[PDB]
Structures are given as C-alpha cells and as structure tokens.
Coordinates of all heavy atoms in Angstrom, one line a residue:
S1021 N 81.0 197.0 128.8 CA 81.7 198.0 129.6 C 83.2 197.7 129.7 O 83.6 196.5 129.8 CB 81.1 197.9 131.1 OG 80.8 199.2 131.6
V1022 N 84.0 198.8 129.5 CA 85.5 198.7 129.5 C 86.1 199.2 130.9 O 85.7 200.3 131.3 CB 86.1 199.5 128.3 CG1 85.4 199.1 127.0 CG2 86.1 201.0 128.6
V1023 N 87.1 198.4 131.4 CA 87.6 198.7 132.8 C 89.1 198.4 132.9 O 89.5 197.5 132.2 CB 86.8 197.9 133.8 CG1 87.5 197.8 135.1 CG2 85.4 198.5 134.0
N1024 N 89.9 199.1 133.7 CA 91.3 198.6 134.1 C 91.2 197.7 135.4 O 90.8 198.2 136.4 CB 92.2 199.7 134.3 CG 92.5 200.5 133.0 OD1 92.4 199.9 132.0 ND2 92.5 201.8 133.1
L1025 N 91.6 196.5 135.3 CA 91.5 195.6 136.4 C 92.9 195.4 137.0 O 93.8 194.9 136.4 CB 90.9 194.2 136.0 CG 90.9 193.2 137.1 CD1 89.9 193.6 138.2 CD2 90.5 191.9 136.5
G1026 N 93.1 195.9 138.3 CA 94.3 195.8 139.0 C 94.2 194.5 139.9 O 93.3 194.4 140.7
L1027 N 95.2 193.6 139.8 CA 95.3 192.4 140.6 C 96.4 192.4 141.6 O 97.6 192.3 141.3 CB 95.4 191.2 139.6 CG 94.2 191.2 138.7 CD1 94.4 190.3 137.4 CD2 92.9 190.8 139.4
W1028 N 96.0 192.4 142.9 CA 96.9 192.4 144.0 C 96.9 190.9 144.4 O 95.9 190.4 144.9 CB 96.4 193.2 145.1 CG 96.8 194.7 145.1 CD1 97.5 195.3 146.1 CD2 96.3 195.7 144.2 NE1 97.6 196.7 145.8 CE2 96.9 197.0 144.7 CE3 95.5 195.8 143.1 CZ2 96.7 198.2 144.1 CZ3 95.3 197.0 142.5 CH2 95.9 198.2 142.9
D1029 N 98.1 190.4 144.4 CA 98.3 189.0 144.8 C 98.7 189.0 146.3 O 99.3 190.0 146.8 CB 99.4 188.3 143.9 CG 99.5 186.8 144.1 OD1 98.6 186.2 144.8 OD2 100.4 186.2 143.5
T1030 N 98.3 188.0 147.1 CA 98.7 188.0 148.5 C 99.1 186.6 148.8 O 98.6 185.6 148.2 CB 97.6 188.4 149.5 OG1 96.6 187.3 149.6 CG2 96.9 189.7 149.1
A1031 N 100.1 186.4 149.7 CA 100.6 185.1 150.1 C 99.6 184.5 151.1 O 99.1 185.2 152.0 CB 101.9 185.3 150.7
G1032 N 99.5 183.1 151.1 CA 98.6 182.5 152.1 C 99.4 182.2 153.4 O 98.8 181.7 154.3
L1033 N 100.7 182.6 153.4 CA 101.6 182.2 154.5 C 101.2 182.8 155.8 O 100.9 184.0 155.9 CB 103.0 182.6 154.1 CG 103.6 182.1 152.8 CD1 104.8 183.0 152.3 CD2 104.0 180.7 153.0
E1034 N 101.2 182.1 156.9 CA 100.9 182.6 158.2 C 101.8 183.8 158.6 O 101.2 184.8 159.2 CB 100.9 181.4 159.2 CG 99.5 180.8 159.4 CD 98.4 181.8 159.6 OE1 98.6 182.9 160.2 OE2 97.3 181.6 159.1
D1035 N 103.1 183.8 158.2 CA 104.0 184.9 158.5 C 103.6 186.2 157.9 O 104.2 187.2 158.2 CB 105.4 184.5 158.2 CG 106.1 183.6 159.2 OD1 105.9 183.7 160.4 OD2 107.0 182.8 158.8
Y1036 N 102.7 186.2 157.0 CA 102.4 187.4 156.3 C 101.0 187.9 156.7 O 100.4 188.8 156.1 CB 102.8 187.4 154.9 CG 104.3 187.5 154.8 CD1 105.1 186.4 154.9 CD2 104.9 188.7 154.8 CE1 106.5 186.5 154.9 CE2 106.3 188.9 154.8 CZ 107.1 187.8 154.9 OH 108.5 188.0 154.8
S1037 N 100.4 187.3 157.7 CA 99.0 187.6 158.1 C 98.8 189.1 158.5 O 97.7 189.5 158.4 CB 98.5 186.6 159.2 OG 99.1 187.0 160.4
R1038 N 99.8 189.8 159.0 CA 99.7 191.2 159.3 C 99.8 192.2 158.2 O 99.5 193.4 158.3 CB 100.8 191.6 160.3 CG 100.4 191.6 161.7 CD 101.8 191.9 162.3 NE 101.9 193.0 163.2 CZ 103.0 193.2 164.0 NH1 103.9 192.3 164.1 NH2 103.0 194.2 164.8
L1039 N 100.3 191.6 157.1 CA 100.4 192.5 156.0 C 99.2 192.5 155.2 O 98.8 193.5 154.6 CB 101.6 192.0 155.1 CG 102.8 191.9 156.1 CD1 103.9 191.4 155.3 CD2 103.2 193.2 156.8
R1040 N 98.4 191.3 155.3 CA 97.3 191.2 154.4 C 96.3 192.3 154.5 O 95.8 192.8 153.6 CB 96.6 189.8 154.5 CG 97.4 188.7 154.0 CD 96.7 187.3 154.1 NE 95.9 187.0 155.3 CZ 96.2 186.0 156.2 NH1 97.3 185.3 156.0 NH2 95.4 185.8 157.2
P1041 N 95.9 192.7 155.8 CA 94.9 193.8 155.9 C 95.4 195.1 155.3 O 94.6 195.9 154.9 CB 94.7 193.9 157.4 CG 95.1 192.6 157.9 CD 96.3 192.3 157.1
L1042 N 96.7 195.2 155.1 CA 97.2 196.4 154.5 C 96.8 196.4 153.0 O 96.6 197.5 152.4 CB 98.7 196.6 154.6 CG 99.2 196.8 156.1 CD1 100.7 196.9 156.1 CD2 98.5 197.9 156.8
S1043 N 96.8 195.2 152.4 CA 96.3 195.1 151.1 C 94.8 195.2 150.9 O 94.4 195.7 149.8 CB 96.7 193.7 150.6 OG 98.1 193.5 150.4
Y1044 N 94.0 194.8 151.9 CA 92.6 194.9 151.8 C 92.0 196.2 151.7 O 91.0 196.4 151.1 CB 91.9 194.2 153.0 CG 92.3 192.8 153.3 CD1 92.1 192.2 154.5 CD2 92.8 192.0 152.3 CE1 92.4 190.9 154.7 CE2 93.2 190.7 152.5 CZ 92.9 190.2 153.7 OH 93.3 188.9 154.0
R1045 N 92.8 197.2 152.3 CA 92.4 198.6 152.3 C 92.2 199.1 150.9 O 93.1 198.8 150.1 CB 93.6 199.5 152.9 CG 93.8 199.2 154.4 CD 94.9 200.1 154.9 NE 96.2 199.9 154.1 CZ 97.3 200.5 154.6 NH1 97.3 201.2 155.7 NH2 98.5 200.3 153.9
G1046 N 91.1 199.8 150.6 CA 90.9 200.4 149.3 C 90.5 199.4 148.2 O 90.3 199.8 147.1
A1047 N 90.2 198.1 148.6 CA 89.8 197.1 147.6 C 88.4 197.3 147.1 O 87.5 197.6 148.0 CB 89.9 195.7 148.1
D1048 N 88.1 197.0 145.8 CA 86.8 197.0 145.2 C 86.1 195.6 145.3 O 84.9 195.5 145.2 CB 86.8 197.4 143.8 CG 87.3 198.9 143.7 OD1 86.5 199.8 144.0 OD2 88.4 199.1 143.2
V1049 N 87.0 194.5 145.3 CA 86.5 193.2 145.1 C 87.6 192.3 145.6 O 88.7 192.6 145.5 CB 85.9 192.9 143.7 CG1 87.0 193.1 142.6 CG2 85.3 191.5 143.6
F1050 N 87.2 191.1 146.2 CA 88.1 190.1 146.6 C 87.8 188.8 145.8 O 86.7 188.5 145.5 CB 87.9 189.8 148.1 CG 88.3 190.9 149.0 CD1 87.3 191.6 149.7 CD2 89.6 191.2 149.2 CE1 87.7 192.6 150.5 CE2 90.0 192.2 150.0 CZ 89.1 192.9 150.6
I1051 N 88.9 188.1 145.4 CA 88.7 186.8 145.0 C 89.2 185.9 146.2 O 90.3 186.1 146.7 CB 89.5 186.5 143.7 CG1 88.9 187.2 142.5 CG2 89.7 185.0 143.4 CD1 89.8 187.3 141.4
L1052 N 88.3 185.0 146.7 CA 88.6 184.2 147.9 C 88.6 182.8 147.4 O 87.6 182.3 147.0 CB 87.5 184.4 149.0 CG 87.6 183.6 150.3 CD1 89.0 183.5 150.8 CD2 86.7 184.1 151.4
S1053 N 89.8 182.3 147.4 CA 90.2 181.0 146.8 C 90.3 179.9 147.8 O 90.8 180.1 148.9 CB 91.5 181.1 146.1 OG 91.3 181.7 144.8

C-alpha cells in the first residue's frame, strides 16, 4: 500500500502545552515517545 505520511513535530516544553491540542486536531495517528 502507497501513502503520503505527514509528520507534525511538537515540542515537549511546558510553555507550549496549550498549543499541543491544536496540533492533535485532525490527527490519524500519534507517535508517543
């Protein structure tokens, strides 16, 4: 199967904790590291 994989990077920084859910919207899969 052939696919385009879009990778959204997010910072682990506490100061960016309100932005992260904006990135989660519309996601197909998470990598949780």
